[PDB]
Amino acid sequence: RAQERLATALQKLEEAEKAADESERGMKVIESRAQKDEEKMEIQEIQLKEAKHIA
Amino acid sequence: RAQERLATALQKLEEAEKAADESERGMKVIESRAQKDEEKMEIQEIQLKEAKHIA
Amino acid sequence: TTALVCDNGSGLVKAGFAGDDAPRAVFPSIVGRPRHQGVMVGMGQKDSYVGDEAQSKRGILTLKYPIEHGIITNWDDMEKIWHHTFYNELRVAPEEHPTLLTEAPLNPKANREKMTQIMFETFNVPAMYVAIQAVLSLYASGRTTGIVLDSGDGVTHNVPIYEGYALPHAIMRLDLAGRDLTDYLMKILTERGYSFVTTAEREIVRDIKEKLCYVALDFENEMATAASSSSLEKSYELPDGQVITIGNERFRCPETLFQPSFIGMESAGIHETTYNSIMKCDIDIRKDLYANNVLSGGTTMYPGIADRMQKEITALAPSTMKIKIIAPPERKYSVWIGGSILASLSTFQQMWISKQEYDEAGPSIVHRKCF
Amino acid sequence: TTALVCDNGSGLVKAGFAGDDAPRAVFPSIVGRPRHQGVMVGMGQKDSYVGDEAQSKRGILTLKYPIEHGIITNWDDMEKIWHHTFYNELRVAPEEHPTLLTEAPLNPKANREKMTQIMFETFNVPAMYVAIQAVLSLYASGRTTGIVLDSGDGVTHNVPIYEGYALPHAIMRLDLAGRDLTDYLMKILTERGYSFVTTAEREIVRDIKEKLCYVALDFENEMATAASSSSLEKSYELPDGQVITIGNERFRCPETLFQPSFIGMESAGIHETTYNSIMKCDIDIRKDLYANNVLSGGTTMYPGIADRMQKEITALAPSTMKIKIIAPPERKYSVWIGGSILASLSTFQQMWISKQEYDEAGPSIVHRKCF
Amino acid sequence: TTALVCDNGSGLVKAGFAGDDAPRAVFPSIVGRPRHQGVMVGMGQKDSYVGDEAQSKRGILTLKYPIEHGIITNWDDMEKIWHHTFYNELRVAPEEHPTLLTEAPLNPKANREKMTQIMFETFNVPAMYVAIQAVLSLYASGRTTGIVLDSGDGVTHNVPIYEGYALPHAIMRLDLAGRDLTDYLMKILTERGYSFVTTAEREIVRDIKEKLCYVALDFENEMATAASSSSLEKSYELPDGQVITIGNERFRCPETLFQPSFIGMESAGIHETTYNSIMKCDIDIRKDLYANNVLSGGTTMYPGIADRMQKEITALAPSTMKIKIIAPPERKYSVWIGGSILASLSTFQQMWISKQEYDEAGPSIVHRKCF
Ligand SMILES: Nc1ncnc2c1ncn2[C@@H]1O[C@H](COP(=O)(O)OP(=O)(O)O)[C@@H](O)[C@H]1O
Ligand SMILES: Nc1ncnc2c1ncn2[C@@H]1O[C@H](COP(=O)(O)OP(=O)(O)O)[C@@H](O)[C@H]1O
Ligand SMILES: Nc1ncnc2c1ncn2[C@@H]1O[C@H](COP(=O)(O)OP(=O)(O)O)[C@@H](O)[C@H]1O
């Protein structure tokens, strides 16, 4: 029974490192997307100020 | 030894799950930030077209 | 000479020396007494265990908290707590150390009066001082403005400070905290089949809460997610086996902070008392307050509470403000850290209350300019 | 058509029709199975006896209760109990009658869901409804406010109600009841040599309790009176002969309700959980609650329990309020009487859970506003 | 035909008929809604209680005020209040009665416009008119010259009048009133350990204030005598007991009117805004105004407020002038008395706003010469 729950612990470890590498790759892609979003939102905030000033 | 490695695999699973679910929370708050960004974007683009037409 | 910073809290005592980076002694503020009879003759049982020992002997004791909501209700138990702190955890003699003590806003005055009477007569400290928890949080956060939300274990409060001046008419205090969250979690676990009734099972439930609970970003969507999926359920291992699995109870417990009608209180959530304190403050400082919203204390430590409160306060405030929530990782110890900073400041050394001043003016000296 | 009112309780089944003054079928909630071999061929004996027949065949069976503390633990046994109730005591076809069931506050949810599933799939009733025992007790008492203390055989609970609104945060539930009193009496009767160990001598001890036990108005004075005199010592005659004499344990048994430390429980007496429920309610309904303290259930049938409860609650509450305890003679059946009243109310005929609603929404439809 | 005189105010509706000595319907302007579950089927309970009925069920409802500072902030609640006043307290059909309403100086215009729109479209009165509260106080006082201080429950104002001409540039309005005094008394009662947080406990605190508070003649000497002796301590009995003992906060509460810095306001006391309105007026009428200083409204009802205000205004004004403060015993109802007088005047019958005028000119007719 020790080897049984041992094998289940090891397969859980495999799929768990799967979930972990998915977590890390996802957070990388999502932090890149984030930084892009803030670049866009700051440039558009400045453009909103420009527009109201011209108005 | 079997029990030792069982427990160690368990605690590693715990750590990986912590990291993965925190990443999930982060990506959810990020995508919500992105939709809020997009709606602010549409509003500010519309006031931009208004300001430009009136100018 | 060096000072002692004892943030007695309500549910955790934190003590240490002024000038440290962290408290040296951290243990529950608990006094346990045996409730069974005791048959082994000669082992010499004692009559009251205080502190972290009472959690080891937890199975045969009745655990009392000497302090209920900020307020001390059992002065003998509190003297035992302080004696344990001074002698058996720090190993110092209080006859040669000034002591800075910490208190929540809007408490009774006899609380402070008896506190200083005890510190001067029972323990014979050379000086002492009582500070507000929120001010010390704002010291430790490295700010000088900001609205601080200090959610401990008995009391939650907002204290808006601007430029070093506090706005007392805008201080809000709420009696919902970690102890009420623990009671709600007990009462809400009972509907899944588990029952925890004794004061020694209250501690197990508090551990479950700390280890598994979190704040949902959207309560209705998380409720539907738990009702449909099963990816939310975690298991916990009781101190005798028999794992328990909890589902939507994980985010349904700390949601009481944002909907205190769950426990039958009428007041408003923390996100709403924060906004109401801001709107009581003068119109010229509300932008800075929106930008400097500081969290501290153990109950602000759930995962997702900062994101939830930012979403809420942002939906409340005008759409042209920058709402920002400061939540350091060492939140739980912010009051103690700020207390250490304050007591080490050199300007502070003439703001202690000395033994001479006390013997001169009685315990009333506590509410004077030496606050 | 007529509705049935089945007050399952825990240790006594009470069933009848909606619109009667009393239940027409009161029998124990036990299921017995033979434990010996059985030699006479042609006896053709059954394999399990239910209800009042098991109490006749006690000496041959092992008696099991399918309900521990409100909670049902043996679903096959409980289904046998219900089948017996429908077909042998009442002699009705359950596919033509709505059925109103009762439950205690703060039970698991699967209890209620599985009960509904059984009543719709197995017995095929047209409608059903699960009601809280304390609310029905208040219906039968004629009040509309008041704090009700329903001490049955599994659980004890207080449920404060004001103007027809229940205050759920102030509901208290204690797992001390008549079954625990029976076990304590079995245990302390060994001080005089009498030994009752079998599952069928528990019924004899329950009879002794019902017929001889009473609540002392003052416990130390009755202790001294029993130590000195013999005027309070009474006798009882077993099914075998050999009378037994009961001394001061006539009033040490029900005193466990006011001192749960006798059976090693941590909690506080019924007089103190009642007062704590009061003090947990609002401030401006406490006077009415003090004046309308309603007792129901079989464990409140001891002589002197109302006077004791009044003395205790009076010593607890402030000295300027009239504390009154309502204890009708038909206490034991109050839940059933109120259930009959409720199910006969014409306004109620829209609160049933119809069978089509269930077929379309699953057993989860029980926790909806029909809760 | 008769006219109705409805003096709303912020926290006490008082109405009646034009030509009486007093209002026949005085009740709080609160709308309660149940906040708890509701268990008794067939109770048939309502969804919102208004007026004095909501005061008997405080322990169950959450109480709202539809008027914050003169201004109406909840039009649905206010429509309910008016419906109750017309049909349940007075029992009159409002389609056959002209109605005289009041409001404070310097309110928004939409308040008044929406008020008349409601009174014509919803309640369908034949005519209506809105009057300034200070003018009606001056009618009831029997004068035609004087500076009137009308401290209600949401707003305080001074309105100087000379020979029937009102000087609009010298009108002062201050948003400190009885509601802020109640909030301050709740806040400073916590120094002795009493905590009132519920909207239903706000009413307990208001009754405490009304029954025990008074204005000190000399604030520093009263603080000294309260610190030294104990002859000021007075007890109050809550709806249950635990009689509370009130010391110097008997007079620290209404002192907020003379030192608005207590609640963190920047403005000056009522004595100083009265003097400033005087010195804002001309120079030829200041003597008459000093001699005709008229108090009205409920917040002017503290024992000692007249003597205190005379001491202050006398210290402010020149020494050759005789200051006089008129404080009738029926101050709380002065606005209603004056409204009844005015509406009964035969000259006034040409000043109503008829329904045809409204239909042809819109709600703008209210700020027009039809004032
Ligand atoms: N990680 C955590 N998540 C949620 N709650 C926590 C966590 N850690 C501690 N707590 C709660 O914080 C409370 C202690 O807060 P604390 O800062 O000690 O206040 P005090 O010092 O006044 O007792 C405890 O009741 C505990 O339930
Ligand atoms: N006269 C009495 N005195 C003391 N206890 C009694 C008396 N009558 C009944 N009981 C106790 O009441 C219990 C049954 O209570 P009951 O109202 O039937 O609850 P339930 O229906 O949930 O079993 C039994 O265990 C019995 O011991
Ligand atoms: N005897 C009193 N002493 C002190 N304050 C009082 C007294 N009577 C009434 N009040 C205060 O007056 C307020 C009501 O004033 P009122 O004349 O009704 O103004 P409004 O009609 O505009 O609400 C209440 O808030 C109450 O606190």
PDB file of C-alpha atoms in Angstrom, chain D residues 30-196:
ATOM      1  CA  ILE D  30     -36.224   2.068  17.157  1.00  0.00           C
ATOM      2  CA  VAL D  31     -35.515  -0.867  14.868  1.00  0.00           C
ATOM      3  CA  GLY D  32     -34.717  -4.208  16.485  1.00  0.00           C
ATOM      4  CA  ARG D  33     -33.104  -7.306  15.030  1.00  0.00           C
ATOM      5  CA  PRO D  34     -32.883 -10.718  16.704  1.00  0.00           C
ATOM      6  CA  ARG D  35     -29.516 -11.613  18.170  1.00  0.00           C
ATOM      7  CA  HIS D  36     -30.076 -15.276  19.098  1.00  0.00           C
ATOM      8  CA  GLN D  37     -30.362 -18.228  16.766  1.00  0.00           C
ATOM      9  CA  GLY D  38     -33.977 -19.360  16.735  1.00  0.00           C
ATOM     10  CA  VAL D  39     -34.809 -23.030  17.051  1.00  0.00           C
ATOM     11  CA  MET D  40     -38.537 -23.555  16.561  1.00  0.00           C
ATOM     12  CA  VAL D  41     -39.060 -24.377  12.903  1.00  0.00           C
ATOM     13  CA  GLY D  42     -42.335 -23.045  11.567  1.00  0.00           C
ATOM     14  CA  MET D  43     -42.112 -19.976  13.779  1.00  0.00           C
ATOM     15  CA  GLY D  44     -41.605 -18.028  10.555  1.00  0.00           C
ATOM     16  CA  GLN D  45     -40.281 -15.062  12.496  1.00  0.00           C
ATOM     17  CA  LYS D  46     -39.380 -11.764  10.856  1.00  0.00           C
ATOM     18  CA  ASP D  47     -35.903 -10.291  10.564  1.00  0.00           C
ATOM     19  CA  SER D  48     -36.488  -6.784  11.918  1.00  0.00           C
ATOM     20  CA  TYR D  49     -39.148  -5.299  14.171  1.00  0.00           C
ATOM     21  CA  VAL D  50     -40.011  -1.612  14.070  1.00  0.00           C
ATOM     22  CA  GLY D  51     -41.596   0.702  16.568  1.00  0.00           C
ATOM     23  CA  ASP D  52     -43.688  -0.503  19.468  1.00  0.00           C
ATOM     24  CA  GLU D  53     -43.305  -4.182  18.619  1.00  0.00           C
ATOM     25  CA  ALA D  54     -39.565  -4.055  19.260  1.00  0.00           C
ATOM     26  CA  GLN D  55     -40.274  -2.812  22.778  1.00  0.00           C
ATOM     27  CA  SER D  56     -42.311  -5.952  23.370  1.00  0.00           C
ATOM     28  CA  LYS D  57     -39.588  -8.208  21.976  1.00  0.00           C
ATOM     29  CA  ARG D  58     -36.808  -6.275  23.774  1.00  0.00           C
ATOM     30  CA  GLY D  59     -35.301  -9.299  25.472  1.00  0.00           C
ATOM     31  CA  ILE D  60     -34.588 -10.951  22.123  1.00  0.00           C
ATOM     32  CA  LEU D  61     -33.519  -8.022  19.908  1.00  0.00           C
ATOM     33  CA  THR D  62     -30.762  -5.446  19.613  1.00  0.00           C
ATOM     34  CA  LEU D  63     -32.411  -2.035  19.533  1.00  0.00           C
ATOM     35  CA  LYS D  64     -30.860   0.601  17.289  1.00  0.00           C
ATOM     36  CA  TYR D  65     -31.886   4.198  16.845  1.00  0.00           C
ATOM     37  CA  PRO D  66     -31.568   5.497  13.274  1.00  0.00           C
ATOM     38  CA  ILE D  67     -31.205   9.146  14.410  1.00  0.00           C
ATOM     39  CA  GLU D  68     -28.272  10.152  16.596  1.00  0.00           C
ATOM     40  CA  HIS D  69     -28.531  13.910  17.236  1.00  0.00           C
ATOM     41  CA  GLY D  70     -31.164  15.121  14.851  1.00  0.00           C
ATOM     42  CA  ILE D  71     -28.989  13.641  12.121  1.00  0.00           C
ATOM     43  CA  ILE D  72     -30.055  10.410  10.450  1.00  0.00           C
ATOM     44  CA  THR D  73     -27.271   7.840  10.343  1.00  0.00           C
ATOM     45  CA  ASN D  74     -29.005   4.700   9.042  1.00  0.00           C
ATOM     46  CA  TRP D  75     -31.056   5.454   5.968  1.00  0.00           C
ATOM     47  CA  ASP D  76     -32.376   1.925   5.503  1.00  0.00           C
ATOM     48  CA  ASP D  77     -33.579   1.861   9.104  1.00  0.00           C
ATOM     49  CA  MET D  78     -35.168   5.284   8.741  1.00  0.00           C
ATOM     50  CA  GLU D  79     -36.925   4.144   5.583  1.00  0.00           C
ATOM     51  CA  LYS D  80     -38.303   1.179   7.518  1.00  0.00           C
ATOM     52  CA  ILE D  81     -39.514   3.566  10.215  1.00  0.00           C
ATOM     53  CA  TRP D  82     -41.332   5.689   7.660  1.00  0.00           C
ATOM     54  CA  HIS D  83     -42.865   2.671   5.947  1.00  0.00           C
ATOM     55  CA  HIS D  84     -44.161   1.424   9.286  1.00  0.00           C
ATOM     56  CA  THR D  85     -45.552   4.862  10.113  1.00  0.00           C
ATOM     57  CA  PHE D  86     -47.382   5.233   6.818  1.00  0.00           C
ATOM     58  CA  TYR D  87     -48.798   1.754   6.410  1.00  0.00           C
ATOM     59  CA  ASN D  88     -49.201   0.175   9.846  1.00  0.00           C
ATOM     60  CA  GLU D  89     -49.887   2.981  12.321  1.00  0.00           C
ATOM     61  CA  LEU D  90     -51.743   5.453  10.087  1.00  0.00           C
ATOM     62  CA  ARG D  91     -52.949   3.123   7.309  1.00  0.00           C
ATOM     63  CA  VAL D  92     -52.770   5.673   4.505  1.00  0.00           C
ATOM     64  CA  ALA D  93     -51.342   5.685   1.018  1.00  0.00           C
ATOM     65  CA  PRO D  94     -48.520   8.255   0.914  1.00  0.00           C
ATOM     66  CA  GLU D  95     -49.037   8.933  -2.796  1.00  0.00           C
ATOM     67  CA  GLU D  96     -52.229  10.864  -2.000  1.00  0.00           C
ATOM     68  CA  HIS D  97     -51.099  13.024   0.901  1.00  0.00           C
ATOM     69  CA  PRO D  98     -48.659  15.910   1.222  1.00  0.00           C
ATOM     70  CA  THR D  99     -46.216  15.362   4.052  1.00  0.00           C
ATOM     71  CA  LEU D 100     -44.764  17.964   6.400  1.00  0.00           C
ATOM     72  CA  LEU D 101     -41.490  16.897   8.009  1.00  0.00           C
ATOM     73  CA  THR D 102     -39.610  18.602  10.819  1.00  0.00           C
ATOM     74  CA  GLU D 103     -35.914  19.143  11.443  1.00  0.00           C
ATOM     75  CA  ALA D 104     -33.690  20.841  13.981  1.00  0.00           C
ATOM     76  CA  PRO D 105     -31.687  23.978  13.197  1.00  0.00           C
ATOM     77  CA  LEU D 106     -28.104  23.719  12.018  1.00  0.00           C
ATOM     78  CA  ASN D 107     -28.110  20.160  10.697  1.00  0.00           C
ATOM     79  CA  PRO D 108     -26.166  18.987   7.661  1.00  0.00           C
ATOM     80  CA  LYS D 109     -27.730  19.789   4.336  1.00  0.00           C
ATOM     81  CA  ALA D 110     -27.467  16.261   2.986  1.00  0.00           C
ATOM     82  CA  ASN D 111     -29.811  15.165   5.764  1.00  0.00           C
ATOM     83  CA  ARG D 112     -32.586  17.359   4.403  1.00  0.00           C
ATOM     84  CA  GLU D 113     -31.780  16.655   0.756  1.00  0.00           C
ATOM     85  CA  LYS D 114     -31.776  12.881   1.191  1.00  0.00           C
ATOM     86  CA  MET D 115     -34.984  13.090   3.215  1.00  0.00           C
ATOM     87  CA  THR D 116     -36.659  14.906   0.324  1.00  0.00           C
ATOM     88  CA  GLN D 117     -35.265  12.456  -2.205  1.00  0.00           C
ATOM     89  CA  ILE D 118     -36.641   9.525  -0.209  1.00  0.00           C
ATOM     90  CA  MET D 119     -40.066  11.087   0.219  1.00  0.00           C
ATOM     91  CA  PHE D 120     -40.388  11.715  -3.509  1.00  0.00           C
ATOM     92  CA  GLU D 121     -38.766   8.617  -5.019  1.00  0.00           C
ATOM     93  CA  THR D 122     -39.542   5.830  -2.547  1.00  0.00           C
ATOM     94  CA  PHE D 123     -42.848   6.897  -1.012  1.00  0.00           C
ATOM     95  CA  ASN D 124     -43.946   8.989  -3.992  1.00  0.00           C
ATOM     96  CA  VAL D 125     -45.780  11.723  -2.050  1.00  0.00           C
ATOM     97  CA  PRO D 126     -47.262  14.588  -4.105  1.00  0.00           C
ATOM     98  CA  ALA D 127     -45.682  17.397  -2.091  1.00  0.00           C
ATOM     99  CA  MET D 128     -43.480  17.809   0.946  1.00  0.00           C
ATOM    100  CA  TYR D 129     -42.018  20.448   3.208  1.00  0.00           C
ATOM    101  CA  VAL D 130     -39.353  20.488   5.916  1.00  0.00           C
ATOM    102  CA  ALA D 131     -40.016  22.787   8.857  1.00  0.00           C
ATOM    103  CA  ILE D 132     -37.987  23.917  11.855  1.00  0.00           C
ATOM    104  CA  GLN D 133     -39.103  22.484  15.170  1.00  0.00           C
ATOM    105  CA  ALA D 134     -38.886  25.701  17.180  1.00  0.00           C
ATOM    106  CA  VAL D 135     -41.017  27.713  14.759  1.00  0.00           C
ATOM    107  CA  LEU D 136     -43.747  25.085  14.916  1.00  0.00           C
ATOM    108  CA  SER D 137     -43.511  25.081  18.689  1.00  0.00           C
ATOM    109  CA  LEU D 138     -44.158  28.818  18.643  1.00  0.00           C
ATOM    110  CA  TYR D 139     -47.178  28.317  16.383  1.00  0.00           C
ATOM    111  CA  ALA D 140     -48.639  25.845  18.862  1.00  0.00           C
ATOM    112  CA  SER D 141     -47.888  28.113  21.818  1.00  0.00           C
ATOM    113  CA  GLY D 142     -50.061  30.927  20.461  1.00  0.00           C
ATOM    114  CA  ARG D 143     -47.235  33.477  20.493  1.00  0.00           C
ATOM    115  CA  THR D 144     -45.605  35.353  17.679  1.00  0.00           C
ATOM    116  CA  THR D 145     -42.485  36.496  19.552  1.00  0.00           C
ATOM    117  CA  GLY D 146     -40.488  34.691  22.181  1.00  0.00           C
ATOM    118  CA  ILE D 147     -37.353  32.605  22.573  1.00  0.00           C
ATOM    119  CA  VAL D 148     -38.132  28.915  22.368  1.00  0.00           C
ATOM    120  CA  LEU D 149     -36.039  26.184  24.009  1.00  0.00           C
ATOM    121  CA  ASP D 150     -36.823  22.871  22.309  1.00  0.00           C
ATOM    122  CA  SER D 151     -35.121  20.095  24.261  1.00  0.00           C
ATOM    123  CA  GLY D 152     -35.949  16.846  22.526  1.00  0.00           C
ATOM    124  CA  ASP D 153     -34.044  13.580  22.809  1.00  0.00           C
ATOM    125  CA  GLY D 154     -31.183  14.245  20.425  1.00  0.00           C
ATOM    126  CA  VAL D 155     -30.598  17.995  20.463  1.00  0.00           C
ATOM    127  CA  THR D 156     -31.417  21.123  22.428  1.00  0.00           C
ATOM    128  CA  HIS D 157     -31.755  24.474  20.719  1.00  0.00           C
ATOM    129  CA  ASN D 158     -32.848  28.062  21.312  1.00  0.00           C
ATOM    130  CA  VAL D 159     -34.427  29.999  18.461  1.00  0.00           C
ATOM    131  CA  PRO D 160     -35.349  33.636  19.201  1.00  0.00           C
ATOM    132  CA  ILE D 161     -38.236  34.969  17.120  1.00  0.00           C
ATOM    133  CA  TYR D 162     -39.666  38.487  17.152  1.00  0.00           C
ATOM    134  CA  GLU D 163     -42.844  39.475  15.319  1.00  0.00           C
ATOM    135  CA  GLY D 164     -42.455  36.421  13.146  1.00  0.00           C
ATOM    136  CA  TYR D 165     -38.853  37.185  12.179  1.00  0.00           C
ATOM    137  CA  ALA D 166     -36.203  34.729  13.285  1.00  0.00           C
ATOM    138  CA  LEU D 167     -32.736  35.933  14.142  1.00  0.00           C
ATOM    139  CA  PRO D 168     -30.442  33.246  12.728  1.00  0.00           C
ATOM    140  CA  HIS D 169     -27.209  34.612  14.130  1.00  0.00           C
ATOM    141  CA  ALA D 170     -28.611  34.076  17.633  1.00  0.00           C
ATOM    142  CA  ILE D 171     -29.678  30.457  17.144  1.00  0.00           C
ATOM    143  CA  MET D 172     -27.909  28.144  19.569  1.00  0.00           C
ATOM    144  CA  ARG D 173     -27.704  24.370  19.367  1.00  0.00           C
ATOM    145  CA  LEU D 174     -26.448  22.026  22.059  1.00  0.00           C
ATOM    146  CA  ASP D 175     -25.977  18.273  21.719  1.00  0.00           C
ATOM    147  CA  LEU D 176     -27.075  17.412  25.258  1.00  0.00           C
ATOM    148  CA  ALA D 177     -30.505  15.871  25.597  1.00  0.00           C
ATOM    149  CA  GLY D 178     -32.516  12.990  27.002  1.00  0.00           C
ATOM    150  CA  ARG D 179     -30.257  10.334  25.517  1.00  0.00           C
ATOM    151  CA  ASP D 180     -27.242  11.771  27.307  1.00  0.00           C
ATOM    152  CA  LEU D 181     -29.261  12.029  30.499  1.00  0.00           C
ATOM    153  CA  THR D 182     -30.148   8.344  30.167  1.00  0.00           C
ATOM    154  CA  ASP D 183     -26.506   7.430  29.703  1.00  0.00           C
ATOM    155  CA  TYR D 184     -25.496   9.482  32.719  1.00  0.00           C
ATOM    156  CA  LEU D 185     -28.164   7.795  34.813  1.00  0.00           C
ATOM    157  CA  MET D 186     -27.018   4.354  33.671  1.00  0.00           C
ATOM    158  CA  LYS D 187     -23.529   5.362  34.741  1.00  0.00           C
ATOM    159  CA  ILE D 188     -24.340   6.797  38.167  1.00  0.00           C
ATOM    160  CA  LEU D 189     -26.763   4.022  39.044  1.00  0.00           C
ATOM    161  CA  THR D 190     -23.745   1.738  39.424  1.00  0.00           C
ATOM    162  CA  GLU D 191     -22.851   3.458  42.689  1.00  0.00           C
ATOM    163  CA  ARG D 192     -25.603   1.409  44.318  1.00  0.00           C
ATOM    164  CA  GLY D 193     -24.875  -1.870  42.554  1.00  0.00           C
ATOM    165  CA  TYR D 194     -27.490  -1.847  39.825  1.00  0.00           C
ATOM    166  CA  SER D 195     -25.946  -2.570  36.430  1.00  0.00           C
ATOM    167  CA  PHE D 196     -27.742  -1.893  33.149  1.00  0.00           C
TER     168      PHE D 196
END
